[PDB]
Amino acid sequence: ISIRAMGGRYLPLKTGEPSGFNPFQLPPTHANLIFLKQFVKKLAAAGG
Amino acid sequence: DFDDELLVLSGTPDNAEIAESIIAEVGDDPAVWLPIFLDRVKAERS
């Protein structure tokens, strides 16, 4: 309620509804590639 | 700043797994490949 009152985006993340943000359109610079490689290496956890 | 030697001395499997890559590409001599290892460190540091 407050964050809406201060006139900014508030994302009400909840289960069952689409996330709304994803890294698909990330910039392709080598540092950003480093980050995205790190993320997918961290997202992978179901792989023991 | 001593960080240029901290990221060398400090233990990090992540940093080591790219140090190994850069040594594999150029394994001439530690006196020689040290500047380029620091270069790739500066390349990942952002």
Distance from the A16 Cα atom to the nearest Cα atom in chain B, whole angstroms:
35
- The tokens describing B37, both together, are 């290892």
- Chain B residues whose C-beta is within 8 A of a chain A C-beta are 43-44, 46
- What residue has token string 């909840």? A14
Does residue A43 sit at the B interface (CB-CB below 8 Å)? no
Inter-axis angle of helices B13-25 and B30-44, to 10 degrees?
120
What is the DSSP code (8-state) at residue A14?
-
To probe the interface with B, which of A29, A33, A34 has the most B CB atoms within 10 Å?
A: A34
- What residue has token string 């901290």? B6
| Rg (chain B; Cα; Å) | 10
User: B41, B7 in Cβ contact below 8 A?
Assistant: yes
User: B3, B11 in Cβ contact below 8 A?
Assistant: no
Q: How was this structure determined?
A: cryo-EM
Cβ contacts of residue A5 below 8 Å, gap of 6+? none
Other residues' Cβ atoms within 10 Å of the Cβ of residue A34:
15
Helix then strand then coil, in percent of chain B rounded to 5, is: 75, 0, 25
